[PDB]
Amino acid sequence: ELPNYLVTLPARLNFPSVQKVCLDLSPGYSDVKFTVTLETKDKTQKLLEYSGLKKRHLHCISFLVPPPAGGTEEVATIRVSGVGNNISFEEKKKVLIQRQGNGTFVQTDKPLYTPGQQVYFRIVTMDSNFVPVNDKYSMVELQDPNSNRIAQWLEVVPEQGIVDLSFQLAPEAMLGTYTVAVAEGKTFGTFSVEEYVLPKFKVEVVEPKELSTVQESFLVKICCRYTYGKPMLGAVQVSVCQKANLPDKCRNLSGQTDKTGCFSAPVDMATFDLIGYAYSHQINIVATVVEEGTGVEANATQNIYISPQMGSMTFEDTSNFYHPNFPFSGKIRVRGHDDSFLKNHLVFLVIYGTNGTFNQTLVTDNNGLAPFTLETSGWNGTDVSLEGKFQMEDLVYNPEQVPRYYQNAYLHLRPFYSTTRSFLGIHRLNGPLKCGQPQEVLVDYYIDPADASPDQEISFSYYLIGKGSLVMEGQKHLNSKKKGLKASFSLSLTFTSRLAPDPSLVIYAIFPSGGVVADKIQFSVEMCFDNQVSLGFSPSQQLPGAEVELQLQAAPGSLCALRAVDESVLLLRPDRELSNRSVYGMFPFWYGHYPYQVAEYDQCTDLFSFFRDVGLKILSNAKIKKPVDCSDSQVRQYFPETWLWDLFPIGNSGKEAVHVTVPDAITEWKAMSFCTSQSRGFGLSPTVGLTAFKPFFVDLTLPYSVVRGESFRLTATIFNYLKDCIRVQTDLAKSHEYQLESWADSQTSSCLCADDAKTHHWNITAVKLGHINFTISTKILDSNEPCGGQKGFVPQKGRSDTLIKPVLVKPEGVLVEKTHSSLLCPKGKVASESVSLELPVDIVPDSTKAYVTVLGDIMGTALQNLDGLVQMPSGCGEQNMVLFAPIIYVLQYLEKAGLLTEEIRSRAVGFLEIGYQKELMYKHSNGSYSAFGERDGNGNTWLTAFVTKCFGQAQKFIFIDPKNIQDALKWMAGNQLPSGCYANVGNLLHTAMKGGVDDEVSLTAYVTAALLEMGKDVDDPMVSQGLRCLKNSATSTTNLYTQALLAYIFSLAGEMDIRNILLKQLDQQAIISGESIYWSQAVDVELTAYALLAQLTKPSLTQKEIAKATSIVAWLAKQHNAYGGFSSTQDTVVALQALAKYATTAYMPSEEINLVVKSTENFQRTFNIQSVNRLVFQQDTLPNVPGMYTLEASGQGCVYVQTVLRYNILPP
């Protein structure tokens, strides 16, 4: 009898967690002493210290993880040693300790906001074991669509791992996709802001789910459903279309819905491409429903792939491996073409192997499961292949017609390592298992009584492993004294949130000959949270304005964050999802085997592959490893946007019930919640709904913006959902803020029967500016006369309705935007400038809107993109030169703008040090620099000028050799000729690189501009040699690009004789866009960089040119694709060069600026711009009648202040 040990532990170790190690003991020993200890570079801790017993003992302990030595990565050594009585077993393996990603998300109360409203958001950080961490937040920033950090929160703490923040938008807040970025990382939450109106109906496809070629005609059922669940009536236009790989094959249906509310029509596919491979097999259905009377329309899209498979069957519950000389079992799940499941269907099973191909026929049951149990006695331990088909024949794969093929299932089986003649198998537990409930597994066995021997009571060791960690352990002893036969037993397993969506389970057994019989299966648990959260409403369908009981159920001691939103704002845009797919989605990287830093294998199906397939480190001395192969009335004023945004504390009962008032809307409020306990973990409720509904009410169709002075149509649609015919009476209220031209001058009494909508129309002229209220009241008139064909009934509740709707009113005419700029940049003295706000007097009253905006630092976005540009290095191709070009310009801009942190500068110059050797061996021996390999080809003159530009501006950082400069000087000593330029010779023919046009005088400008940034200047003869080809060529100018490069070459030449003529066609041809002006004609950013770099050469500059250049740096600053994207080979380098010379000339970053604005009627405002809120783009409206304004600034730094006068003019 040979005793043996086993040691198991996880392979990937996480610091904020406690992990499990286990040691398995044979009978015998008991005079030796087995330890397993984790050791590392600075300590060695004790995990298990144990002496053996007379049985198989599985000792399991929980241990805390050491911190990583590098901060996020460690290869620690796990050591097993058995000492005592002159024998010393010793074995070392390796494990990985790493800090896992704390998964961070941000949710908002809505994805879509009007101007003048307040955005609320919640911010959650997560651990991988689903307990939220109270980690410190550095900075939370809220950025513009024009990428200005308009809000910033510094040093904010989460209570119970979550933090709720708020931000107020301007009444004149501009429209686009605002961003909430978190902790300088990957956590982005985008919310859109635009001018909208709330729809009251959604439109959806009902009957076409999936389309196949088997049928001949199908049905479309477009159903328009209101947001409170009632059906509606309107005009439907349906357009079905096919995409061309060219006239689009399309069919248009039209009609009107019914009392059910769904409109149906049959569609035949004689129109669509069902013949062969001509168009795309992807039908697009677009439905447009116009509501009657009001005329508001809704769209509905549906993209349906034309399925060419009649059926598909898979191996859902089948193992990868078979035990030899023992029966095999499996399930086959046979699915149809459109979510249908084949019952009692024929299954053609065929098995391939070294013995040959054998035949099997099968029939399923009325569920769709297909069970097969077979014998592997004749397989003699060889790799076999399972194959399953539908029938004996097959449909013909026509290469010219539409193919109708099947999905024949294939599986490859490899035998278990047959070191024993015993059997151990697990019957599976189908698909999705419910979390929290205890499940039962049935596991069968057969011990052969000739190798294992009868006298030893055998023990089966069961491991339940989830997310690469030993979750639940055990060992069960069964007597084998009876010379036992094939029997079975059961195990109890509970699946929690610590268990995976796909956890595994291994039962092994060790015999006294060293043989192991073992089996590993995988499960399917639904994506669980350990905190069961139930969000409920009582009575879940209430009239609006009354209270409901909101019940939150979670763990005791929880913080429950609740969000209740309207369905209509979800009908504009779909919000960011928060479900079990989303929370589990941002985590996992454990998917499969060991990590690649730590997996050591020997190479030219066993227990080692069983533990490797779950990612569990394991070591022993037994034969557990296969040897290695070489292979009544109610007033309605209300908030339509977010009902509930309150956090709630949960007491010791685990349930909290509150009374909340439903807002005065006829809609569905979708509510959801997520809770946090530190003990149990994170929870998440399913999204529930509260239908706020009244039987008889009023809805208004009105735009949210009405321009003043002229008429617009207001539609009042009255809805009846009762069971009687009622004589309604509508009354539009009268106020001085609007007027009407007597469209039946209100007081309108009219009959309307059940489930009906009646619209009244008015043409209203807006008189007063701003947010004005439209007020309407409806009453049920008494039964004087039997209207509607029957005697009218009068209800008792909800007889009267009154709706008040606000509407923004804007002044009439076109908007003149008169802008003025200033750069108040002092150096330790007060600096006083002034602006003038003047207007031509033809204006409408109350239209003058003016605001003054101060910004500290011009670059207000992508600050971390400059520091993140230094990553992902390479050593081959032309990608390395482009990816390592702009790091020099980025670090030049960092050291000229007070942001050169020495650690990232040292890392970037180390990267450029190891990239300078990988760019130095691209030199041609003729004197130029090569592109693809050494001595491969003579490149263009632009490539030589660019490599001497990126080499000659790196000697302030890194040792660059000077000999290639002299070789390049001898190289273009023959390139330029006085009797004609453009010798050219060679060209860059590279993937997705073109550069510019690169004609004669442009390449002359590159070779006479890029060659002087080694500290060189004028008195050179080579600028005069290039100048001789430009003495006559300056007259032609070759469009705006080459007049910009000729402006660049005479801008640094220092002469004025043929400079100023073409300067009267450069600056005034700029594309003026507010305070962010630029030039146009990839292309536009290159021309703006060339123009800005052309102005910033001469030393004779003043305040107005500096403020104009500040506007150019502002437009180049508010871009994410200019820097951080190296797609264009002369955009990022030239733009950062222009930013570097702008930092060279006058501008310095704002350290501390006290600024104050003053007017003439005793109004002053003081702004404080420190070093931590210099990125904040902060404004202030001006309440004065517009005129003279004075500004002054003091301290250290520069601030850019721009003022805007936006008013409206009536048009002559």
Side-chain angles (χ1 to χ4, degrees), residues 5 16 71 110 149 151 352 368 399 567 581 585 752 941 1030 1074 1077 1184:
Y5 69 100
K110 287 182 302 166
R149 185 189 300 178
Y352 301 90
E567 200 186 8
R581 184 52 281 151
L752 191 66
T941 313
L1030 305 175
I1077 78 176
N1184 201 12

Side-chain angles (χ1 to χ4, degrees), residues 227-239:
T227 184
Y228 46 89
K230 294 318 274 289
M232 52 148 289
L233 281 86
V236 191
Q237 300 225 50
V238 180
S239 161

Side-chain angles (χ1 to χ4, degrees), residues 798-811:
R799 308 177 64 255
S800 178
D801 206 84
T802 294
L803 186 46
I804 292 100
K805 253 292 171 193
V807 50
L808 186 134
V809 173
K810 263 167 177 174

